[PDB]
Design a protein around this ligand. Structure first.
Ligand SMILES: CC(=O)N[C@@H]1[C@@H](O)[C@H](O[C@@H]2O[C@H](CO)[C@H](O)[C@H](O[C@]3(C(=O)O)C[C@H](O)[C@@H](NC(C)=O)[C@H]([C@H](O)[C@H](O)CO)O3)[C@H]2O)[C@@H](CO)O[C@H]1O
Ligand SMILES: CC(=O)N[C@@H]1[C@@H](O)[C@H](O[C@@H]2O[C@H](CO)[C@H](O)[C@H](O[C@]3(C(=O)O)C[C@H](O)[C@@H](NC(C)=O)[C@H]([C@H](O)[C@H](O)CO)O3)[C@H]2O)[C@@H](CO)O[C@H]1O
Lengths: 39, 287, 99, 49, 237, 287, 237, 237, 39
C-alpha cells in the first residue's frame, strides 16, 4: 500500500479463524459425543 | 472453541459399534444446538485426508466483489426549456436499490468495512462521434448542501472531496473508509431514528454513507447526448456479525423489508418452494 | 467565544450577544434556554467551536459553557444552569430542569 | 433572585461563552454552509485584464 | 441433570423440572461496560437487584390457529418496575437479558414452539410500500402477533430462523426454554425508547393438538435484565 | 506546555467533592483565559479510555485540499473581427475569488506553504467532434511582461516556466514553492504597499504568487469553440499562525474585506444568527 | 478560603462565594450500612449517582412578617426524581443528607436566619389536646410554616435550638448555610413514608430589613441524599 | 496577589489595585532581534529607556451609546516622544508593546469592555466595493471608532474575537487590562509609517449603566514599546 | 520524492505537536485547578 491511509489497502483475505460453536452449540453445558443429550 | 481452519476436516476410519448407553445418532433439537453426530458414528468410514480449501467462503471474499449500486442516465444538452436532471444529478448513497448486493449484505446483522467505489460512464448520441467529456463526482455528506445547477459555485469543492475524470479514462476509483459513527453499520435497524414518533422506521441515518453529486463539466454541445453513470461498490477489510435468514420474498422498496411474494410459487407468500404432486413424489426421478 | 443567545427580532448587533436578567417579582423564574446543536443555526453557530465544527460532519467530546455576570458590584444573585440530555421536551420549570 | 440596591441598575447582562474541551474530536470534512457565492466577486474579472 | 434448572436474580427465582439445557446467545454472557469501550463520560448508575430480576409479562393463550407472538426488548419492559423507572429517567441504557419462556400441558398434548431471540428484528409490512408505523412496532408489555410467521413478517423465513439464538418447547420433551442474551448493538449504550436490540419470538411450528380434555394452554414469558447500567440522568419521559 | 497529541484525552473517574476553598467551576473571564474547569470537577465521571483520533483536524489536512481558484472560459476561433480573450488570457493569481478556499485561508493571519497547481481544461463546440488541443500555461512573475497575442514571440518562454498539455491528457500539475520574500504569506495586511499615500490598502504585493498566461497553441479551426480552463490550488508543507474570527458577512470584493451582509438574517449586518421568537423559545423542541 | 465552597455529587454541583465553613452534624459523615449493624438480609440496591445528587425544592419568599419554614426528610423528597422512585418501590431506605440553604440580598439589607437540622422533630399542636394530623405533618416538597417559632412549635424553645446541628445566614456575613447529615435513627433502616429522621428548619430570628429598593428576597433549599440504600423491593406505593 | 500589579519601564511606572492577572500574547515575551533571524546588516540603535517607556494617549469618554475604539500600532505612537523621533529618522523599526487600558467607575456602575490586541487588523468599508482610504486607517494618537463592532468592521465577528490576545474590563471585577505584545510580523523589521502590526480594540459589549450620580467615565490607554530597535538611519520624514 | 527539490514532495501529515495554552491560557501566572482565579 503506497497510500498513507491504511484503509486504502487491498483486501485482507487471510483470516482463517473460525468458531462455528457460537452458532451450532450455544448451550451452556457442552454436549458429550454418544451420551444422551437429555439426562 | 476458536481455531484456524484452512481445509475441510479429515475423516477417520471407524469400526462396528454396539455399546450400551452410547447413542451418538440421537439428539435433542429442543436445546437449540445443531446435531453433533459425526459421520464416523453414523456409519463405518474409511480414512480420508481432505485437502479441500475453504478460502472462497471467507467473508472477505464472499462480500469482496464490486457490485452495481447505482445506475443513472440523463440528457446532456442545452436545458433551456426543461421542466429533469439538467446536466447533473444527486444520488443519496444506499445499498438497497440493486437486489443481488442487497440480499448478500442482508445475510448479516452488522457489517464493518471500507468501500472501494468505481464509477463507469457511458455515452450515446441522441451520428457524428462521441465526445470525451470530463465529469465531476463530488462527495457531499448525508443531508448536506448539494448543488442546484451544473454551473453552481458549489462545485468549487473547497473541502468536499471531488474526483474529475474523462469518459476515455479507465473508470474512476477511490476508497471511502468505514465512516459510521458506530463500530459497525447496521444492515437492519429495529428502531426509529428520531426523538419524536413520526420518524421513519428501520432507517438509521448513521448508516447512510452520503450524497454523490455528479455533473458533466463541459458546457453543452450543439446536440444532445444520453449519459449514463454506473457506480459500483466493493467492501473490503470486512468484519461481519450475526448471520440472518436469507430474503425469499421479492423486494418491494429500498426503504423497508415490506413483502408481497410472487403471484405463484416459487417464492410466493404461502409457498416458498415450488410444489410437487405429493410427499412421496420424487421430482427428476431417474427413469 | 461568545454565544449569540439573544438571537431575537428587535435585538440588533451586539445586543444579541448578551442576555439581560432583571429583578423578578415571582419565584423560580425561567430566564432563558439554549438549543445545543453546534451543527445547526442557533446561538452556538457563530462561535469558534461552531464555525470550525461546521467544516466537519461528525463530532464527539465535552463542551463547556461559561457565563460572566456583568452587573454592578452591589448586585447579588444565584442562578442554576442545567443541561438536559435528550429524549423529551425542553424543561420549562426549575423542578424539572434541576433533575 | 437578582437583588440590587436603588442606585445599581436593576437589569443586568450575562455574556455566555462556549468552547470544546480537549476530549473533542471532529471527522469527515465538508464545505462549510456558512459561506457561499452566486456571482463573481467585484474585481475578480479584472484579474484577467 | 440438564433437565432441571433454577435461575435466581435479585429477589426472584424460577425452577423448571423439564428443561433442555439452556442457550447462551453466541456463546456469550452479559457483562458491564468496560472502560476501554465506554463513550458516555458521566458515572453510570448500576442499580443491580432492583432492575436485574425477573419480570413476568401477561400470558397469552396458545390456540389451535395461533400464528405466534413477539415481544421487543427493552420496549416490553420500559414501563415495568425499577427497570422501567431507570429507563424513563435516563437518556442511555445498557443490559443483557435472561429469557425464560414457559408452557406446560399434558402427556396427551402435542405441539412445538420455536423460541428465538432475533437481533435487530426490523419488521416489514405486508402488500404495501408504506413502512410500518410507530404503533405497529411499539407494543410494550402486551407484545405483538405474527401476521405471516412463515416469512418472519420480514420477507425472509422461519425455516432459517434457527441461525439466531434459540430453543424449542416440544411438549412431549420439555415445558420451558431459556436463553441468555448479552448486550447486542453497534454502540456501547443506546436510547431505550426508540431502538430495540432484541425481539423474542415464540412461534408454533407444530400446532397444539390433543384428543383429551380441552384446557386453556397458556404461554408465559419471564425476562430478567442483566448487568443494567444507565447514563444521562434527567427528568422522566 | 507543548506536547504530542494523537488522540482525544481520556476521562478519569471522579468522586464526591465538598472542600472549602476549592471552587473549580468558578472562573474569571476577565483574565482572558478560557475556563479550565474539567468534567471530572463539574460532575462525577467514570473512567474512559478515549481512542478517538485527531488527525483529520491537523492544519496540513484542514487546508490540504485542491480548491478551485480560477475558472475562465473564452472563445477559440478566428478573432479577425473581435473587439475579448483572443485564444489566450492572462490571470493575476490570487486566492480571493472563490469563497470556500478564501474563508478557510482567512481563518489564519499568516501562512507558509508550497502550492500544488492543477489545471483542468474543457471544450464545447459553438456538432462534428471535439478537438484535442494543446495548451500552454506560462508562469510570468507578478507585474512582469505578459504576451499580447496568441502568436506573440513572448511565448518562446526562454526562462519563464511553461507547461504544455493536451485536453486528452490528465489535468496538468506542478508545484509552485513557497515563494514569498518574507517567512510567510500575509493572509491579511493592515498597511499600504507603497511609500506614497495613494497606494492600495490591504494588498501586500509580496503575497501575489504571480501571473498565469494560458493560450491555445493550435491555430484556429474553421469553426469556433468555447474553452474553459479551471485552476486548482492545494497548499502543502503548511505552517499557520494566529487563528482569526471566521468571515460571516458575504464577500463583496477580492481586493478588500468590505461588507454589507445579506438582506435578511442569517448573516445580515445586524443579525448573524437567524431569529427565534424569544430567549425562552426552544427551536426544534421535541413534541 | 473557608468563605468559598463547591459541593459536587452525581451530575450536580453548587458553589458559594460567601459561606461560613460548614457543619458536619455531630462531627459525623454519611456512610453505607456495615455488615455488623445490618438487619434486613436481602441484597440492597445502592443507586449512587441517580439518587445521591442535589434536589432543589421550590423557593419561599422571606417577608418582613415571616415566621419561618420547615421541610421534613425524607418526606420532602419522597416524590422527587430517582430518589423518590426508589422510595416508592422499596419498603426500606437509609441515607444521609447534604443540605445547602441559599439566600442572598444586598449590602444594605439586614436579617438573620437560623438554619437548623432537628432530629425527630415531633410537632405539637397549639391550644388543644388533639394530636397533629397526617396532613399537618406530611407537607412533602412544599414544606410547612412555623406557627410559634418562639417555642419551635413543640413547646420548647428556639433559644436553645442551637443544641442541634446548625448554621446561620446573617446577610451582612454570608449568603448560604451548609449542613452534612448522617443517618440518624435507632434502627439501621426505616420505612420512608411514615417516619422522618430530620427536619430542616429555617427561622428568621432577626427580620429582613432595609431602606433601599424593595425586592423579593427568596430562600432556596437544595438537598442531596448521600449513601442511599434501599431494601424490600416490591411494587410502587 | 494577582489583583494588584506594578509595571515599570524606563522613567515610567503604573500600578493597579484591581487587575485580573495579565496577558502575554500567545504566551510570548518581547525580545531583541537575534543574529540568526536578522536581515538588515547595519548596526542597529537600541535606545532602551528613551523609547521603552509608557506613553499615555488622550482619553476617550465611555458613553451609553458608544460603539468602541481602536488604536493602531505603531501609528498611534509614531509622533510621540523619542519613540516617534527614532521612527521618523529610521527606515526600519522593530518592537514589542506593553498595553495597559484603564477604566474605573463605582460599585454601582456596570459595564464590560473587551480589550483585544488584533494582529494585522485589516479594516473593511461598509456597503461599498471601494477599499478604505489612507485617512480611514491612519488616525495616529487619536485612534478611531468602530462603525459596526458586531463584525469588527471587517465582516467577521466580535463574538469570536476572543481567539486573539485579550482581557476584559468588567466594572464589578477590575479597573484595568494588561497585555504584553511581542513583535508580530512575517519579517524581522518593518517600515513603521505604512504598516501596523497590531490594533488595540476596546469595545463595550455590555453598555455602561447605573442609577447613581451620573459622571464622565473615561477610558485611558497607556502603551510602552519594548525592546525597540531601529535600522536604516537617514533624515526625518 | 523522486524530484530533486524537496518542496515538490507529498504532504507532511505527521506533526502532532500541540500547545493550546498559547490561545487558551496566555496569562503570565498559571491558574491552579480549584483555586479562586482572583485572589
Ligand atoms: C412442471 C412441473 O413438473 N413441476 C413444476 C416445477 O417445475 C415448478 O418448479 C419451478 O420450476 C422452475 C423450473 O421451471 C425452477 O427450478 C423454479 O426454481 C427457482 C430456480 O432455481 O431457478 C427458485 C428460485 O428461487 C426462483 N427465483 C426467483 C427470483 O423467484 C426461480 C424463478 O422463479 C425462475 O427461475 C423463473 O424464471 O426458480 C421451481 O420452483 C413448481 C412451482 O409450484 O411447479 C411444478 O408444477
Ligand atoms: C421559519 C421558522 O420557524 N424560523 C426561521 C428560521 O428557520 C430561520 O433560520 C434559518 O433557517 C434556515 C433553514 O431554513 C437555515 O438553517 C439558516 O441557517 C444557515 C444554515 O445552516 O444552512 C446558516 C448559514 O450560515 C447560512 N449561509 C449563508 C451562506 O448565508 C445559511 C443560508 O442562508 C441558507 O442555507 C439559505 O439557503 O443558513 C437559518 O438561519 C430564521 C431567520 O431569521 O427565521 C426564523 O423565523
Amino acid at each position: 500500500n503506497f497510500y498513507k491511509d491504511s484503509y486504502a489497502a487491498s483486501a485482507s483475505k487471510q483470516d482463517f479463524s473460525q468458531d462455528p460453536s457460537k452458532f451450532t452449540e450455544p448451550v451452556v453445558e457442552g454436549l458429550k459425543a454418544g451420551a444422551p443429550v437429555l439426562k | 472453541v476458536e481455531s484456524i481452519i484452512k481445509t475441510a476436516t479429515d475423516t477417520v476410519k471407524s469400526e462396528i459399534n454396539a455399546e450400551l448407553g452410547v447413542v451418538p445418532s440421537l439428539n435433542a433439537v429442543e436445546t437449540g444446538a445443531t446435531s453433533n453426530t459425526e459421520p464416523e458414528e453414523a456409519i463405518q468410514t474409511r480414512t480420508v485426508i481432505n485437502q479441500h480449501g475453504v478460502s472462497e467462503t471467507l467473508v472477505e471474499n464472499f462480500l469482496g466483489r464490486a457490485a452495481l449500486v447505482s445506475k443513472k442516465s440523463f440528457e446532456y444538452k442545452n436545458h433551456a426549456s426543461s421542466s429533469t436532471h439538467k446536466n447533473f444529478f444527486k444520488w443519496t448513497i444506499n445499498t438497497k436499490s440493486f437486489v443481488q448486493l442487497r440480499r448478500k449484505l442482508e445475510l448479516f446483522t452488522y457489517l464493518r468495512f471500507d468501500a472501494e467505489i468505481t464509477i463507469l460512464t457511458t455515452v450515446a448520441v441522441n451520428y457524428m462521434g462521441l465526445p470525451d467529456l470530463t465529469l465531476q463526482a463530488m462527495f457531499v455528506p448525508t443531508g448536506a448542501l448539494t448543488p442546484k445547477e451544473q454551473d453552481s459555485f458549489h462545485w468549487q469543492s473547497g473541502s468536499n472531496a471531488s474526483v474529475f475524470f474523462k469518459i476515455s479514462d479507465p473508470p474512476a476509483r477511490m476508497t471511502i473508509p468505514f465512516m459510521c459513527i458506530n463500530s459497525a453499520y447496521s444492515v437492519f435497524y429495529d428502531g426509529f431514528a428520531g426523538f419524536e414518533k413520526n420518524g421513519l422506521y428501520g432507517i438509521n441515518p448513521a448508516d447512510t454513507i452520503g450524497n454523490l453529486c455528479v455533473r458533466i463539466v463541459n458546457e453543452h454541445q450543439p446536440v444532445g447526448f444520453t449519459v449514463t453513470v454506473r457506480v459500483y461498490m466493493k467492501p473490503k477489510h470486512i468484519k461481519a456479525w450475526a448471520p440472518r435468514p436469507p430474503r425469499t420474498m421479492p423486494y418491494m422498496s429500498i426503504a423497508n423489508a415490506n413483502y408481497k411474494g410472487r403471484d405463484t410459487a416459487p417464492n410466493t407468500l404461502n409457498a416458498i418452494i415450488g410444489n410437487r404432486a405429493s410427499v412421496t413424489t420424487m421430482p427428476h426421478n431417474i427413469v | 467565544s461568545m454565544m449569540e443567545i439573544n438571537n431575537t427580532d428587535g435585538a440588533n448587533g451586539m445586543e444579541r450577544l448578551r442576555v439581560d436578567i432583571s429583578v423578578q417579582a415571582d419565584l423560580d423564574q425561567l430566564l432563558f434556554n439554549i438549543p445545543l446543536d453546534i451543527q445547526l443555526d442557533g446561538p452556538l453557530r457563530n462561535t469558534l467551536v461552531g464555525n470550525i465544527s461546521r467544516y466537519y460532519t461528525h463530532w464527539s467530546g465535552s463542551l463547556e459553557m461559561t457565563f460572566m455576570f456583568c452587573g454592578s458590584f452591589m448586585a447579588t444573585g444565584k442562578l442554576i444552569l442545567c443541561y438536559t440530555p435528550p429524549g423529551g421536551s425542553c424543561p420549562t420549570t426549575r423542578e424539572t430542569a434541576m433533575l | 433572585n437578582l437583588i440590587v440596591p436603588s442606585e445599581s441598575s436593576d437589569t443586568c447582562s450575562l455574556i455566555g461563552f462556549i468552547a470544546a474541551k480537549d476530549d473533542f474530536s471532529l471527522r469527515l470534512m465538508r464545505d462549510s454552509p456558512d459561506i457561499g457565492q452566486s456571482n463573481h466577486l467585484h474585481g475578480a474579472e479584472a484579474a484577467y485584464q | 441433570s440438564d433437565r432441571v434448572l433454577q435461575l435466581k436474580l435479585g429477589n426472584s427465582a424460577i425452577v423448571t423440572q423439564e428443561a433442555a439445557n439452556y442457550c447462551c446467545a453466541y456463546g456469550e454472557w452479559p457483562n458491564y461496560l468496560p472502560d476501554h469501550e465506554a463513550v458516555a463520560i458521566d458515572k453510570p448508575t448500576q442499580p443491580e437487584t432492583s432492575t436485574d430480576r425477573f419480570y413476568t409479562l401477561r400470558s397469552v393463550k396458545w390456540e389451535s390457529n395461533s400464528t405466534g407472538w413477539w415481544w421487543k426488548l427493552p420496549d416490553a419492559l420500559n414501563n415495568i418496575g425499577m427497570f422501567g423507572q431507570n429507563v424513563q429517567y435516563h437518556y442511555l441504557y445498557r443490559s443483557g437479558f435472561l429469557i425464560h419462556v414457559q408452557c406446560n400441558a399434558t402427556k396427551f398434548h402435542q405441539g412445538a414452539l420455536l423460541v428465538v431471540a432475533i437481533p435487530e428484528h426490523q419488521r416489514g409490512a405486508h402488500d404495501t410500500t408504506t413502512s410500518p408505523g410507530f404503533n405497529d412496532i411499539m407494543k410494550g408489555e402486551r407484545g405483538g402477533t405474527f401476521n405471516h410467521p412463515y416469512v418472519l413478517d420480514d420477507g425472509t423465513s422461519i425455516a432459517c430462523a434457527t441461525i439466531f439464538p434459540h430453543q424449542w418447547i416440544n411438549l412431549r420433551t420439555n415445558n420451558s426454554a431459556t436463553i441468555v442474551l448479552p448486550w447486542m448493538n453497534v454502540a456501547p449504550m443506546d436510547f431505550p425508547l426508540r431502538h430495540n436490540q432484541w425481539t423474542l419470538a415464540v412461534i408454533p411450528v407444530v400446532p397444539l393438538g390433543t384428543r383429551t380434555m380441552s384446557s386453556v394452554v397458556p404461554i408465559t414469558v419471564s425476562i430478567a435484565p442483566m448487568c443494567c447500567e444507565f447514563n444521562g440522568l434527567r427528568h422522566a419521559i
